[PDB]
Amino acid sequence: YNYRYRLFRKSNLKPFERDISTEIYQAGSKPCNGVEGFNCYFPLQSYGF
Amino acid sequence: IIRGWIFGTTLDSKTQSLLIVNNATNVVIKVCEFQFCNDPFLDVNCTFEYVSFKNLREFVFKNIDGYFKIYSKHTPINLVRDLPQGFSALEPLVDLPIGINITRFQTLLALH
Ligand SMILES: *[C@@H]1O[C@H](CO)[C@@H](O[C@@H]2O[C@H](CO)[C@@H](O)[C@H](O)[C@H]2NC(C)=O)[C@H](O)[C@H]1NC(C)=O
Ligand SMILES: *[C@@H]1O[C@H](CO)[C@@H](O)[C@H](O)[C@H]1NC(C)=O
Ligand SMILES: *[C@@H]1O[C@H](CO)[C@@H](O)[C@H](O)[C@H]1NC(C)=O
Numbered sequence: 001y002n003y004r005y006r007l008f009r010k011s012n013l014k015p016f017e018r019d020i021s022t023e024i025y026q027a028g029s030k031p032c033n034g035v036e037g038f039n040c041y042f043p044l045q046s047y048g049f
Numbered sequence: 050i051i052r053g054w055i056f057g058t059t060l061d062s063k064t065q066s067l068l069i070v071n072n073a074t075n076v077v078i079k080v081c082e083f084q085f086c087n088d089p090f091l092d093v094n095c096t097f098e099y100v101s102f103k104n105l106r107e108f109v110f111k112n113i114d115g116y117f118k119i120y121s122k123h124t125p126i127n128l129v130r131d132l133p134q135g136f137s138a139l140e141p142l143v144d145l146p147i148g149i150n151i152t153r154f155q156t157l158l159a160l161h
Contacts (some may be wrong), residue, residue, distance in 0.1 A: 014113055014114075014115070014116065014150060016146070016148050017115060017148060017149075017150060018065065018096060018115065018147070018148030018149060020064055020065045020082075020096070021063065021064045023063070045154050048151030
C-alpha cells in the first residue's frame with residue numbers, strides 16, 4: 001500500500017501539475033472538516049499488489 | 050529594497066509554494082511548503098531548487114504547462130515616478146519545470 005493514487009475530489013489536474021495535498025476528499029459537498037463517512041473520505045487509495 | 054517574491058495558492062504549508070530570492074551575492078529559487086518569512090519582511094520536502102528610484106527593473110512572470118517563465122529588462126530612468134511612456138522589449142531569463150500553478154502572489158522586502 002506504499003503505491004497510491006487519487007480517486008476524485010473535484011476538477012482534473014492540468015498537464016504536469018505536481019499535486020502534493022492531503023486534505024479529506026469529498027464524495028459529496030458536506031462540511032467534511034476532517035471526518036470520514038458518507039460524503040467524506042481519505043485522499044489516497046492504494047494497490048493490493 | 051525589493052528582494053524577491055512568493056507564489057502559490059495557500060502560501061501556508063497546506064501545499065507546495067514557489068519562493069524566489071535575490072540575496073545580493075546570488076539569485077536563489079526553491080519550491081517548498083514551510084514559510085521562513087511567513088510575512089513579507091526580510092532582515093537587512095522542497096521538490097525543486099535553482100541558483101544564478103533611479104533604476105527601473107521590469108519583469109514578466111508567466112505560467113504554462115507546469116513551467117514558470119520569466120522575462121526581464123533594466124534601465125536607468127528620469128520620469129518623476131511613473132513607468133516611462135515609451136517602448137523597449139523584455140528578454141527571456143529562465144524557464145523552470147516546477148509543476149506548481151499559481152492563484153496568489155506577494156513580494157519580499159529588506160528591513161532594518
Ligand atoms: C493549480 O491550480 C488549481 C486551480 O486551477 C488549484 O486548485 C485545485 O486544483 C485541483 C487539480 O489539481 C482541483 O481538483 C481542485 O478543484 C482545485 N481547487 C480549487 C479551489 O480551485 C491547485 O491547488 C493548483 N495546484 C498546484 C500543484 O499548484
Ligand atoms: C511534504 O509537504 C506536504 C504538504 O505540502 C505534506 O502533505 C507531506 O506530508 C510532506 N512530506 C512528508 C514526508 O511529510
Ligand atoms: C546566497 O545564496 C547562495 C546559494 O545558497 C549562498 O552560497 C550564499 O552564501 C548566499 N549569500 C548570502 C550573503 O547569504
